[PDB]
Amino acid sequence: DDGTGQKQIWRIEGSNKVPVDPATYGQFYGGDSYIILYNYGQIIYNWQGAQSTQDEVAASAILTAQLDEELGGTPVQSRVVQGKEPAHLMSLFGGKPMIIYKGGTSRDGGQTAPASIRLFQVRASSSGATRAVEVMPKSGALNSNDAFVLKTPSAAYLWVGAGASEAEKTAAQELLKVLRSQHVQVEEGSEPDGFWEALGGKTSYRTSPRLKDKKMDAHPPRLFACSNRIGRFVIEEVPGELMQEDLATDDVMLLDTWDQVFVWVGKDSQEEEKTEALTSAKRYIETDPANRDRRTPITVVRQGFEPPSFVGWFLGWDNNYWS
Template identity: 30%
Template structure:
C-alpha cells in the first residue's frame, strides 16, 4: 500500500453519512466486523472508550496502554460511549475517524466506510466526526489524559530504536482545555512559540525548551515526558532544561540546526480562534430544487427545522444537522454543501466536520451556541 506525502483532506468526506444507505445491508456488514461485534468487546453494551487502527483494509484493536498515541501514517476509529442521562441506562455514542496526514487513501477510505458500518451497528444514532491530524476537535482531545502524534505508521514499519539510532524530532507540549497535547512538529525554529514547551529529541540528549509564557502544567508534563523517554532508553539519554532566552540557548539552536526569532504565543496556530461570526445555512428542496441559503438572525437550536438539513459553522467545527423529516436529497448533498462552504468562505480546509441527527444532539453541539472559541 503506497503512502502519499500528503493527502488532500479537502476532498475527503464522511462516506455517505446522511444519505439513504441500505441500512440492513450495512447492519449485517457491521455485525460481521469482529472488532466490535464480538460481545466480549462490550461495544454498544457498556460505556467506555475504544480505539481501532486501520491495518491493510482491516480494523484492529489498538492497545489500551497506547490510547492517546497516534501515528501520522495511519487512520483510526475512536468510539466514545456514555450515558447521556444519569437516570437512564441508555447509551449515547460519538464515533470519530482520525486521519493521519501521511495515511494512504486506502486507509482513509476504509476508516470512513468502517465508521458507517459501526454507526449502523449501533443503530444509526451516534454523532459522527471527521478528525484531521493537527486540527482535532476539542472533544476528541479531551478523551485522552495525554495526546501524542508522531511520524510513522503500520506500513512504514515504524519501530522505536535505541537512543543512538533514535530519529531526531521536535515535540510541542501544549495545554488545550484540560488535556496536555504532545505533537511532533517540523524540526525548525519556525515551529517554536513563547506560549508552549518544546522537547528536542536528539537520541542521547533531550532539550526541554520552556517558552517564556508557557503554563506550569506544560512544564510539568514535559518533564514527565522526558523522564519517561529516559527510562525507556535505560538511562542512556539525559535532559537539558532551557528557559527561553537564557545563556544556554546556543546549545539548543545548534542541536536544532536552525535559529531565528521565536514568535509570540498569540501567533501560534493552535491558539484560540479569533471572534469570527458563526453562520447557519439551510439545505432544502421544498421549492422543487435544492437550495443552500444562509439564515439571518441569532442562532439557536429553535432555528433548526425538522423538515430540512442545516449546516452550522460553529468556528471550531462545521456541523451537519439532519432533520428527522428531511428528504433523501437534502441528506445526500449536505456534506457537499458543507465542504463547498468551507472553500468559498476561506475556512481552513482541515476544519472538523460533524454529522448529527435530530434528537441526538450532544453537549459538544449544544455548547457551540454559546462558546466563542474552542
C-alpha cells in the same frame, strides 16, 4: 461525561482494523486514521490524521459502519479530524495529553520508524485540552507561546517559551515519559549551546510580544474565513485549534490577535474578497473602542510569505505545505 469509561482503539491498516496497544492510547500517528469506541449509550469516534492517506480514510468509513451495525446501530457515530477534536474525546485519556507522532502506516509502505532527533510542539487549549504534535527538528519551528520537547538519541530538552502555560509545561513532561528520556528543562532565552546543535541551526523562530503574553487569555487569537462565492461576502469563524489546513487557499483569512489584525490573502482568492476582508478587519477593530486601542494595525500577509509572528499562532507549520 469524563472519558473515564472503558474504550477500545483500533488503527485502520489497508482494510483491516488492528487494535492499539492499550498503554499507548493517548498516542496517535498523523499519517493514519483511527476508530475508537467509548461507553457513557456508546459513541464511536472516527479520527483522521492530518496526513492520513486517502485509502486509509475511505476504508475507515467502511469499517466504522460495520461496528456501529454490530452493536445494533445503537451507538452514535462521530467523525473528527486532527486538531479539531471535541472536548469529550480529549478527556478519554485521563489527564494525559494527546501525542501525535509523525508518519504511521500505509498500503505498500509499512510502519515508518522514528528519527533520533525529534521535536514536539505542546500547545494547550483554553479549557486545558493539551496536544503534543511532532514537528520538524529545526529552531525555526520554536514558538515563544508554547512548550517544546527536543529529544536526541542521547539527552532531551524541555524548552519552555515565555508564553507557555502551566498545562503545556506539565504535558511536556508527560510526553517525556512516553518518550522515555531524562530531560533538561530550559527556559526560553537561556538555552545550552548543546541544544541549538540538535536543531542544527542558529536561531530565528516564531516570536512576538503578543506570543509571550500571559494575558492572551482575555482574548485568544480568533481565525475567521471570509469568502465571497455565493455572491455576497460572508464571514465564518474557524473552530478548534488554528491549523495551516484552515487557511482557505481560495479565499481570504482574518487573524485577529486583538493587539493586531492579520489579513491572510489566499493565492487563489479574489480581489474583492481581499478588499472586503480589509474593511472587515476595520469593523472588527472599531467594534469596541473603549477596550480596543483605536490605532490597531491591520497587516496584510500573503500565502507563502507569512511572518513568524503570524505562523507562531498555528499548531504545526510545513514550509512546503502548499508546495
